[PDB]
Amino acid sequence: KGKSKKWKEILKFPHINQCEDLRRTIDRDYCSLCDKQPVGRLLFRQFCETRPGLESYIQFLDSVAEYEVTPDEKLGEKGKEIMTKYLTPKSPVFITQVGRDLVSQTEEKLLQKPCKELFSACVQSVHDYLRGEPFHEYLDSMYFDRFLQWKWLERQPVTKNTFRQYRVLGKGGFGEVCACQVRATGKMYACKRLEKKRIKKRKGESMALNEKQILEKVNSRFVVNLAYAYETKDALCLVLTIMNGGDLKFHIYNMGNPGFEEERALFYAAEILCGLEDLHHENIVYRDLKPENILLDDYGHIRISDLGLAVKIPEGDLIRGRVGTVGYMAPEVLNNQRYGLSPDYWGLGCLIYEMIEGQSPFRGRKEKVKREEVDRRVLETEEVYSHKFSEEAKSICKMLLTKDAKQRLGCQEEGAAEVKRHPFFRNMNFKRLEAGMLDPPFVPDPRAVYHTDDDFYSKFSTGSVPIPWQSEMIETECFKELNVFGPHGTLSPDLNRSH
């Protein structure tokens, strides 16, 4: 399925003794090793399936997975099924390490009205059990041994020969993004290639590193994810979630009637709002919200896709910096004031207005107007609203485009939640949107085609990102095919240490 012919050789396990060094120097943390890291999760689960009794605790955990995705109308029926499979005195798969005391509390919260995070405490205590003896036993096992081999692979050098590069997907001041493919696994990504020459000439180091490190640590369904970072002779590359559906600028202006139906604009706004929330949760200010930085995936969901201008603000501090794009810079930025998260709500106002109207609020579409004058309109004029806005669209745009940062919607104690409560979004179910369970109102046509250096370079090129790399191995069935053990209760050669 797009894999090279030698992929099994490329991904050949190392012998287990070559992982001696890893064994000594890996934090032996349950949540990370048996839940968060996806290959570690599967291996810990495999191990459990060989110990009489533990497959109950995992079956239960899967049953709750299914519950947390179950709708409200059927939350009761499913809650009752789980109760009489796993938790009662008489249940067939009784789990004893969840208190009867907690069973009691949970029955009472149940018979009232089922609350999506109902088994909050029961899942917790289950993990409290699994992290003791079972986990420590897992560490003794063949199955962790195998995890270390997977980890070994995860850390192998990444170079341009790990990938193949195809069509250009997008372009910018500092380089271009192409569709690329991992040779060994066939998985598709987008490779953002930044010429070393341009970075140095423009002193773009900070921006490049900021972007890499922020994409590395953010994990949001509304922001492109980072899977690899590496260097070539002439470039620095980021391998990112592939977004094949075009950017919002294109979609806005690709019609008689530039501008969307409110339904659709609402929807994008909500997803972008969530994206902003995820970044703010980490104290990142984005600073460059504009339609060309939002892209669609194949299903019509969006992600914030460029973070060159984003920056981490230490807790309890403000930053200075007159950066951004003309027409999308907030007054406090244009005035070179110190600011925090506020400019992003300004940008969100700009995006909603433009999605509805088909034009920046301070700038006609294809209007010959100079930077100086746009900046002037941003600071000195109020924006106008046409017949195209419902009252609630108008309301939210004005509230987000309040010139004073301190008084602007989204910049109070509730943060983003205040924006989610605005009537404009009165129909939108955010919990489901945040869980990826709302279908978008438009699916894109797949038929369209739209010295101090060296130090910086080593900090940039860290290789594979652990969790994305493991998901890749699973998703592409490299895990399933290669994760084989010795036959009939023995060790495979890669695991024998007499070798």
Cβ distance to ligand 453 smaller for residue 110 or 177: 177
Retrieve residue 240's tokens: 């990112």
CB nearer to ligand 453: give 430 or 450: 450
To the question of whether residue 44 is assigned a binding role by annotation, the answer is: no
Closest approach of Cβ 221 to ligand 453, in Å? Answer: 14
- Considering only CA atoms, which of 361, 461, 444, 438 is closest in space to residue 403? 361
The CA distance from 433 to 266, in Å, is 12
Binding mask 166-195 for ligand 453 (x = CB under 6 A): ---xxxxxxxxx------------x-x-x-
Q: Where are the alpha helices (DSSP H) in 239-341?
A: 248-252, 262-281, 331-334
Q: State whether residue 141 is helix, strand or coil.
A: coil
Q: What is the nearest approach in angstroms of ligand 453 to the Cβ of residue 233? A: 18
Q: Which is nearer to ligand 453, 177 or 265 (CB)?
A: 177
Of 145, 288, 306, 494, the catalytic one is 288
User: Which pairing describes strands 294-296 and 284-285: parallel, antiparallel, or unpaired?
Assistant: unpaired
Count of chain residues binding ligand 453 (CB under 6 A): 27
Q: Which helix (H) or strand (E) holds 133?
A: helix 133-140
Give the shortest CB-302-to-ligand 453 separation in angstroms.
11
Binding pattern for the stretch 286-325 against ligand 453, x by CB under 6 A and - elsewhere: ------xx-x---------xx-x-----------------
Decide if 190 contacts 172 (C-beta within 8 A). Answer: no
| Among 61, 119, 163, 211, contact with ligand 453 (rule: CB under 6 A) | 211
Q: How far is the CB of 339 from ligand 453 (least distance, A)?
A: 20
Residues of the chain immediately before an interruption (C to N > 2.5 Å):
450
Within residues 221-280, the interface with ligand 453 by CB under 6 A covers 224, 240-243
234 is catalytic: no
Q: How far apart are CA 134 and CA 289, in angstroms?
A: 47
Beta strands in 223-320 (DSSP E): 226-231, 235-240, 284-285, 294-296, 302-304, 311-312
The response to whether 3 counts as a known ligand-binding position is no
CA nearest to 231, candidates 200, 195, 198: 195
436 marked ligand binding residue? no
Nearer CB in complex with ligand 453: 204/349: 204
Q: Which residues are annotated as a binding site for ATP?
A: 169-177, 192
Residues that bind ligand 453 (CB under 6 A): 169-177, 190, 192, 194, 204, 207-208, 211, 224, 240-243, 292-293, 295, 305-306, 308
Instruction: Please give the positions annotated as active site.
Output: 288
